[PDB]
Amino acid sequence: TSDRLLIKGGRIVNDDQSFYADIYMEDGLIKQIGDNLIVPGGVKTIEANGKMVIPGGIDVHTHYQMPYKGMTTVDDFFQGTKAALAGGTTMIIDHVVPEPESSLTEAYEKWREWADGKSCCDYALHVDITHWNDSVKQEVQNLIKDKGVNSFMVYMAYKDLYQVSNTELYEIFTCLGELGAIAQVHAENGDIIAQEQTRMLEMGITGPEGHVLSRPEELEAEAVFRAITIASQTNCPLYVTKVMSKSAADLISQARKKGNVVFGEPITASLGIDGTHYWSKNWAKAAAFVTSPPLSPDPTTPDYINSLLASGDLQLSGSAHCTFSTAQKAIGKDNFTAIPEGTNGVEERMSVIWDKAVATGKMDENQFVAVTSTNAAKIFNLYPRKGRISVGSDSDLVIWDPDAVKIVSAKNHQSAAEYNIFEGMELRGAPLVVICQGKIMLEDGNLHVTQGAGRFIPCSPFSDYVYKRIKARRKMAVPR
Amino acid sequence: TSDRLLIKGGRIVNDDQSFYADIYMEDGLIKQIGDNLIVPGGVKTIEANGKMVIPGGIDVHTHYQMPYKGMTTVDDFFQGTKAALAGGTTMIIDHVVPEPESSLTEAYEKWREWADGKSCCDYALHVDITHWNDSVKQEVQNLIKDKGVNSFMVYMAYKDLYQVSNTELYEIFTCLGELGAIAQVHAENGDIIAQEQTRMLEMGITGPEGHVLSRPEELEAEAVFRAITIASQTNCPLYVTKVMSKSAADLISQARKKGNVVFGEPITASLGIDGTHYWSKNWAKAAAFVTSPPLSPDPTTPDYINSLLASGDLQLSGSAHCTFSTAQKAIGKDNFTAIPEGTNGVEERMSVIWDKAVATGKMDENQFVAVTSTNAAKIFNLYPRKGRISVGSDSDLVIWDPDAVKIVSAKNHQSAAEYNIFEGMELRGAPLVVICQGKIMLEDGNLHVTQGAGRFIPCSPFSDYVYKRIKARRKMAVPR
Amino acid sequence: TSDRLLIKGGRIVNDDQSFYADIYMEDGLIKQIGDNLIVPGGVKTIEANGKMVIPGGIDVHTHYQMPYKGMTTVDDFFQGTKAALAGGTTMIIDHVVPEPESSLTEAYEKWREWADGKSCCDYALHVDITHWNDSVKQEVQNLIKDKGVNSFMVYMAYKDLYQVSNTELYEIFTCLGELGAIAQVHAENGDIIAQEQTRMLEMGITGPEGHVLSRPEELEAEAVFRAITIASQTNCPLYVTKVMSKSAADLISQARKKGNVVFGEPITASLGIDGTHYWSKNWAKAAAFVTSPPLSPDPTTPDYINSLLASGDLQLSGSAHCTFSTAQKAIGKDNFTAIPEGTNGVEERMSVIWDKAVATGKMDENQFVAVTSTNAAKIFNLYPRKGRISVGSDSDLVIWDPDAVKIVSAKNHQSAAEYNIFEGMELRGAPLVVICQGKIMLEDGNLHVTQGAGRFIPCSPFSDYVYKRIKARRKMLHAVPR
Amino acid sequence: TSDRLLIKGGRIVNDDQSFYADIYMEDGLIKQIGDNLIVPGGVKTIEANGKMVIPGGIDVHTHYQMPYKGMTTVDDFFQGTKAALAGGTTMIIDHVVPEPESSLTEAYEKWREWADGKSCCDYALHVDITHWNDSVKQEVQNLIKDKGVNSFMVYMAYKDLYQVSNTELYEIFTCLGELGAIAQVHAENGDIIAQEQTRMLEMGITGPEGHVLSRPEELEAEAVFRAITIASQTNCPLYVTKVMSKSAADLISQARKKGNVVFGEPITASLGIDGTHYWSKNWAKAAAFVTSPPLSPDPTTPDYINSLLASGDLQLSGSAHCTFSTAQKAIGKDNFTAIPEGTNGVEERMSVIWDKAVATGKMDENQFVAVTSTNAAKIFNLYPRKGRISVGSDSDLVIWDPDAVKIVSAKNHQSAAEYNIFEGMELRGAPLVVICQGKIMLEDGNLHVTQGAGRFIPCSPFSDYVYKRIKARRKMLHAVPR
């Protein structure tokens, strides 16, 4: 599997504490932690020299080689996970997207085949419920029981394509609750967005600004509140993907304070920048920002999202990395509704949070670990195998430099995209060394990776972190 | 029309101020206000003797002789307005309910005929949009232009009967906004209520408690938030009927603080009592409380609703007076979904608010006037004809006694109902004398009324109180 | 008193409704409202020609010729009320400020003498409680009973000068509540501000930016919350002067929703602009913004204050007009704690609100009247004499042009100040004609005024709008018999 | 030190995860965790049989043998820690209270002597800053550096006894922040409470109900908001003791969301019951509830406090166990201000939280551990030595029965008090076995304890959980060059 490796003089930073210790690794696992380790001679030894050592990042939202209209996103499972590793991320969770009226299981097999053959790092899979009926219900059950899936996503947007009704939502959340799965949502109101898009085009607003104006944050907030409400009535845990706005995040905060089982996933884009760039005079640049929900035009938004990720009102971060070329984006040059949706973010996720939340004093290093790996591992039932530096855990570690300062650019990023939405931003905090599966995959700015080295990691239902309260609530007429 | 009448030594209480003055009336109108009025000899003179004189109450939500399954509510336009006058209310606004797929205009004519022939007092009419299509759109326009209607209601509940989709809501609010009408809603989520009713019956909960448990306040709050959101996107003023819960009222408060044009209508029931009585061992008593949305089981609710009516987060009061006999209620004795919905409240509305909000120190007498007549007159475009004691205004006045104390009972109420949901409650504050159309219709506990004396009062669109901001907001691409 | 005057073809805008009618005025009073008025021939007639006619503005917060260290503010009761009238304001309420350990009543007489002799328009007076003891308590009673005062202000700031303790606040609010007066506060925490000033000076931050950084909005919010709490415990109505920050305005909103009797007074400065200009490289410009509480550095502040004035969470507007010359400001050139505090705002108040809340669609014309006159008249017990176009009310009216557009500048303002904190701002909405005491005092951009023409207007205690709930709450304490 | 011990078949429940494993212990420490442990023959073996095994509770607020007017509370460090252990608590943190104008360090030595000689379990000490001056400042430094103290409490109540001013609060929080200590507060407004007490007595309300009516929750909320504000301005972490009311808990929630470093400590009383019993016709019963801040008369309070402990808006639980006899309480029979303040709670703390938050579905077993030990260990810098079942941690463990159901009564409690404020309450969840310092101190309902067995545990300043953000904020003040 993996050679012996010793990291010396490192400061271990887990979500619960930080402490000085050496780390000995072999065959994909952490074997010893402490001082003066009884270790074989001739072991490859890295001198951490007081630098931080954290669990590798888990990016819970990717779209590598995602199909769209006979094309594919430009970062595939190989190049996309190269990008992840370059940024300190050692596990990704991608979305399987079956065509409406097609098999979920057959889609899952396709995605397993693509990723097993190309991923540089360990991965898992969410399965999107793009339509609903009795056979789909059966497949969901089968996928949870037999295929290592515990997370499924529904769409409240994309009217006449993926969108599900309130009756379907109730049916689906009841089912996912009974089976021990996470119920994920893409939460915007598709019915109202459909009208507003028509309204924008009739006003002659065909550029990317038409995208953000046709999807104001009130339509994200409505759909979030409604999802929270249906999930509560069906005793189902809810996970809100791609939290983009202050109002969505406040609804999640509100629901969690009442005791509702609700999680929020901000992304690199909503943590790092705003939507002013939709009004760029450079069409291509503006189209690079087109994603759904969009980036809020309100410039106070990213500081707020970071604040709520710091306080635990939001719990984990993803990227929704979903890159298209300038030529693909330009398909929608005359009509924003035809711009393929998605931006970059996998490489920049951990640096963006360090820069915006840790160097700003909003969160400490332990909460940084929580919001980049450990909470994700707990929610998806991967803890302590992932998201922790502990004996018996997987050898996925990063030597992090808090003092590193790097300018982001399309020129030096691993993505095949020509644009980078964070172009020109100077970020504090970066990885020096990345170890994945016990092997050194980044050092001295050099990537050392193998196509297909990454393993599918099965995720079991009924995560304790998610379901203990649900179960306790389940456990709890007037005779006339 | 109406004989000369002089009220002397009264303390006039309008929404804006209180002051001592005599009031001279003739032919339906207030002619002079002041001291030492130049008045003809031989005028009928009432000695107010320091007592308050307020504008007659406007009850903006009634259902007199409302049809249901070949029956009718037991209080008709005559007996129902007798009840209103006994309680200090001198104008009512009733709901016209066309069958799905039938003409709105034909329904309006029926209701005009019933009320013109029986009402004791002036009235107006809201028209319920029970279904939606091109011909209904046309009728709405015609009714606003030609028939004195400015208020229309849509249902978010009653799946497969009255319920409208989000696309229909957007269409309808856009239309009502363009035409200068108030958009009213019955705001509960019918899709989810349908599931919960099935769930209650499968648990064997067939009594009235199944009604309140199948319609928890979260389902009122969801639908209110969604209506607020669609109304905001379409620049349409929203009016929430039958505010029953703390969470609904808080959403209205929130929206108004942002600047959204939203009004809330608590009712006598939600101001005066809670939903604990759904669990009464007396089936009949419990069924007397069945209304939609239901009374909150949370006993802190009525004090809170009064508080938000006091602070102006809620603006006006109705009753939704909709009475059925015990025999009619008993149709649903084996299945709560078959209990006809509706309770009493028209007679008790003004006394309930005085007792719960004024004698408690939450609101003063001027705000009492506002929330019982003047705000309703402003919203429905009836001010200063109604809701004000002013020269040239209609002679609809009440001599109110703050020190009166009365126990409510089915035995002494004007309603034909056998039950009164406020049975046994002692209320501070009551009318001594009611003058309507310049005629004394209550004195010494005696009603003096004529069937059909009441006039239809046309209500024009584009009320200033409602539409000035809407118009100003209406009045307010990147070239590449 | 005042000649016959007829305004024809006007659209009257009161707080409750708007309607078309002619207005006939004589001897300081509105005599008739309606169509085809029975009127004597030869009456001076103004053609409003569809333009709005509103009640004159009431500015509830001014500091004309306010003394400070042997000097005075540069706009006195004459020039300051010229400024008021030029902007559509026909009544002002100024603050009487007695020196600590001196008589409130003697201070009141000095102020009455200054204003009676110079004011162009009607006025009233608040009295500031700058210190507290038995004789001050007696004077407050006497002033309410005999001198037409119903509003008194206390300071939670200015440690070792004006500041009162929590015991004194309790005593004072109990007393003012018993006597039917409005309890006004200057609400910032003076103990903590003292420390932060020292911290700014030790960091070498001596310019105007040190002023806003030594008084962060948290210190306004703390004092507001504490004043609300003491006022609630003593059944006393509370009025928060100079609402500057979002957080202060949210606490007032929160308290009103619970039923507490609390009023908030934003000022022209907090409605119109933010505090970014404390960091101007021009010292003199930055010092022109120095006022307390300061303008929020958060640029989302003025939009928010306008939003809460629109929704009624805040009820009335003032200016706290308190102007000093550049030479006077420069006394603090080496130390921001020595910059005399105060900015302009009286002339600009009504246009600022129209431009920022009405032309933006946040409030309608009727709420504009409410927040520029009618709510002030109700709170200070001047309604319907002021703040309303009604038969028997005072002839204080403005013909307002919603379509007028004017750039503000020190060059054309009535103030003697060299700086204007709204310099260069283009504002929508302005007065065309101002009538005061039935007399045309502004027309064609010309002022027609007389020194000393203004009358003191006595203000009685126990305003209904303020006290009916307080009284009902007092009317409603049982031991457990054991 | 301590004999070999093996617990088999147990379900370990830490704050982060639960898992099945055997636990081997020797000489005060957990030595091995796992399956098939290499263990010496003849080891005392307990069969957990699938039952939960959790870290022993840490009660961060006790007042054992606290002096008051020449008397003492009736539960001393021995009997009081017997009560603790009976309820699943294996460590207590008590408050050292020096007389005003006396030495903090001398008080600390007295308390160390009392506890070292009587405590059954490990303990630590907070030191209360009952007055403030230069020598007290020096002692605080000395206690942190040399005596294992990292937590100090100030009083915002008790006017003319312990109360500190806003200047003193600023000075004290600045000092505690610089030294790496937790700043604890007793947060009620003492100035206003003094007035309201006098008001209650003048109304003839002398019974216990006068206590809760003279201290309405608004006066707790005001003091909380002010403490948050001063702590924020001085970059000092704040810990709110005895969170009793919904409004206090909402202010802590609000401040934490903004990023302020603020902790809240609900107590057994506020988690388990309300204040309706102040109106009991039995004087003695009512007086048994007298504590400060008092129990809220609002019966929705305890459900809400449990909800905010569940969501993490409040982080840790104490008891403020402070018991007086009926005869001692009765000293205030004619005047509630003379009733000695304090109730029971140490024994009942963990069962109350299980019954009211876990069996109700508000929180899971892992958050239960967090709020009964682990968050306290992190805040006071005792993690992972305490609050965790981990190799190298202290052998303080409890075998917990989720299915146990017990009625609370004065008849069977360990306290010397005649009254129990939870009398008659049936609580779900109880300890079966308690191990402390590796020794079985509760089994089969029998206590096995030794007077003086407990050790003082030094607590170091600059806890990472508390100070990493504070430090980062300090690391991040430019003048405008003109």
Q: How many CB atoms lie within 10 A of CB C168?
A: 17
Q: How far is C350 from chain D (nearest CA, A)?
A: 34
CB-based contact B464 C253, cutoff 8 Å: no
Which chains, if any, share at least 3 CB pairs under 8 A with chain B?
A, C
Residue A20 belongs to what H/E stretch? strand A18-26
Distance CA C156, CA C224 (A): 9
Residue A32 is classified by DSSP as: E
Give the tokens for residue B183. Answer: 């958009």
Name the residue in chain C with its Cα closest to that of B249: C257
Task: Give the residues after which the backbone of chain A is interrupted, taking a C-to-next-N distance over 2.5 angstroms as a break.
Answer: 476
Tell me, letter by letter, the H, E, C secondary structure of C47-78. ECCCCEEEECEEEEEECCCCEECCEECCCCHH
Q: How far is B79 from chain A (nearest CA, A)?
A: 33
Name the residue in chain A with its Cα closest to that of B200: A477
- Quote the crossing angle between the two packed helices C301-311 and B246-258, to the nearest 10°: 120
User: Which residues of chain C are within 8 Å of residue D203 when distances are taken between CB atoms?
Assistant: 477, 479
- C-alpha count within 13 angstroms, C-beta hemisphere, residue B430: 17
Residue with tokens 């200054």: C114
User: Which residues of chain C are within 8 Å of residue B258 when distances are taken between CB atoms?
Assistant: 307
The three-point CA angle C370-C375-C381 to 5° equals 145
**A:B CB pairs within 8 Å:** 92
User: Which residues of chain A are within 8 Å of residue D465 when distances are taken between CB atoms?
Assistant: 366
CB-based contact A167 B191, cutoff 8 Å: yes
Residue with tokens 């309006």: B108
The CATH label, of 3.50.50.60, 3.90.1640.10, 3.60.20.30, 3.20.20.140, for the domain at D56-428 is: 3.20.20.140
- C-alpha count within 13 angstroms, C-beta hemisphere, residue B457: 24
Q: Which residues pair with C263 in a beta bridge?
A: C239
Residue of B193, B210, B189, B192 whose CA lies nearest to B201: B210
Which of D17, D257, D364 is opposite residue A469, by nearest beta carbon? D364
For β-strands D182-186 and A426-436, DSSP reports them as unpaired
Can you name the CATH fold of A1-55+429-480?
Urease, subunit C; domain 1 (2.30.40)
CB-based contact D203 C279, cutoff 8 Å: no
Residue B98 is classified by DSSP as: P
CB-based contact D192 C480, cutoff 8 Å: no
DSSP string covering C288-324: HT--SSPPPS-TTHHHHHHHHHHHTSS---B--B---
For β-strands A57-62 and D262-266, DSSP reports them as unpaired
The three-point CA angle D250-D256-D260 to 5° equals 130
Report the SS3 class of residue D85: helix
CB-based contact C364 B469, cutoff 8 Å: yes
Which of C256, C358, C361 is opposite residue B311, by nearest beta carbon? C256
Locate the domains of chain A by residue range.
1-55+429-480, 56-428
Distance CA B44, CA A126 (A): 83
Residue with tokens 């629109």: C310
Distance CA D357, CA D360 (A): 5
Cα→Cα distances C241→C183, C214, C217, C467, Å: 10, 20, 14, 19
Residues in B whose CB is inside 8 Å of some CB of A read 165-167, 170, 189, 191-192, 194-196, 203-207, 209-210, 216, 218-219, 221-222, 225-226, 229-230, 232-233, 279-283, 286, 477-480
Name the residue in chain D with its Cα closest to that of A309: D257
Distance CA C279, CA C294 (A): 13
User: Which residues of chain B are within 8 Å of residue C19 when distances are taken between CB atoms?
Assistant: none
C162 φψ region: left (φ > 0), alpha (ψ -120 to 50), beta (else): alpha
- Quote the crossing angle between the two packed helices B246-258 and B301-311, to the nearest 10°: 20
Which of A256, A383, A468 is opposite residue D365, by nearest beta carbon? A468
Name the residue in chain A with its Cα closest to that of D384: A17
**C:D CB pairs within 8 Å:** 96
Which of C189, C207, C210 is opposite residue D166, by nearest beta carbon? C189
Compute CA A297 distance to the chain's CA centroid, rounded to the nearest angstrom: 22
Which of B167, B195, B225 is opposite residue A222, by nearest beta carbon? B225
- Reported resolution, Å: 2.1
Cα→Cα distances B475→A203, B229, C359, D179, Å: 15, 21, 9, 60
Dihedral sign computed on CA atoms, order A188, A190, A192, A194:
positive
Distance CA D222, CA D238 (A): 15
Q: How far is D249 from chain C (nearest CA, A)?
A: 16
Cα→Cα distances D196→C48, C236, D187, D201, D214, Å: 59, 15, 16, 9, 5
The CATH label, of 2.30.40.10, 3.40.50.10320, 3.30.1370.60, 3.40.1670.10, for the domain at C1-55+429-482 is: 2.30.40.10
User: Which residues of chain A are within 8 Å of residue B196 when distances are taken between CB atoms?
Assistant: 233
Distance CA D143, CA D146 (A): 5
User: Which residues of chain D are within 8 Å of residue A253 when distances are taken between CB atoms?
Assistant: 257
**Which residues contact residue B303 at a Cβ distance below 8 angstroms, ignoring those fewer than 6 apart?**
B356
Q: Check if the beta carbon of residue A235 is closer than 8 Å to that of residue A473.
A: yes
Give the tokens for residue C441. Answer: 């005092």
Q: Check if the beta carbon of residue C87 is closer than 8 Å to that of residue C422.
A: no
CB-based contact D232 C219, cutoff 8 Å: no
Report the SS3 class of residue B142: helix
Distance CA D305, CA D243 (A): 8
Which of A464, A466, A470, A476 to mutate to test binding with chain D, by most D CBs within 10 Å of its CB? A464
Report the SS3 class of residue D63: coil
User: Which residues of chain A are within 8 Å of residue B192 when distances are taken between CB atoms?
Assistant: 166, 170, 229-230, 233
Dihedral angle computed from the Cα positions of residues D169, D172, D173 and D176, in that order, rounded to the nearest 10 degrees? -160
Q: How many CB atoms lie within 10 A of CB A45?
A: 12
Report the SS3 class of residue B153: strand
Residue D310 belongs to what H/E stretch? helix D301-311
Residue type present at position C164: V
Q: Check if the beta carbon of residue D351 is closer than 8 Å to that of residue D406.
A: yes
Distance CA D435, CA D396 (A): 5
Distance CA C36, CA C47 (A): 14
Which of B310, B362, B473 is opposite residue C361, by nearest beta carbon? B473
CB-based contact D256 A313, cutoff 8 Å: no
CB-based contact C259 B362, cutoff 8 Å: yes
Q: How far is D177 from chain A (nearest CA, A)?
A: 16
Report the SS3 class of residue A203: coil
Distance CA D433, CA A337 (A): 66
Q: Check if the beta carbon of residue A349 is closer than 8 Å to that of residue A57.
A: yes
User: Which residues of chain D are within 8 Å of residue A258 when distances are taken between CB atoms?
Assistant: 307
CB-based contact D366 A468, cutoff 8 Å: yes
CB-based contact D359 A383, cutoff 8 Å: no
Q: In terms of residues, how long is chain C?
A: 482
Distance CA D322, CA D338 (A): 16
Distance CA D178, CA D172 (A): 10
First CA to last CA across chain B, in angstroms? 70
State which approach was used to obtain the coordinates.
X-ray
Which of D257, D361, D472 is opposite residue A473, by nearest beta carbon? D361
**Which residues contact residue D444 at a Cβ distance below 8 angstroms, ignoring those fewer than 6 apart?**
none
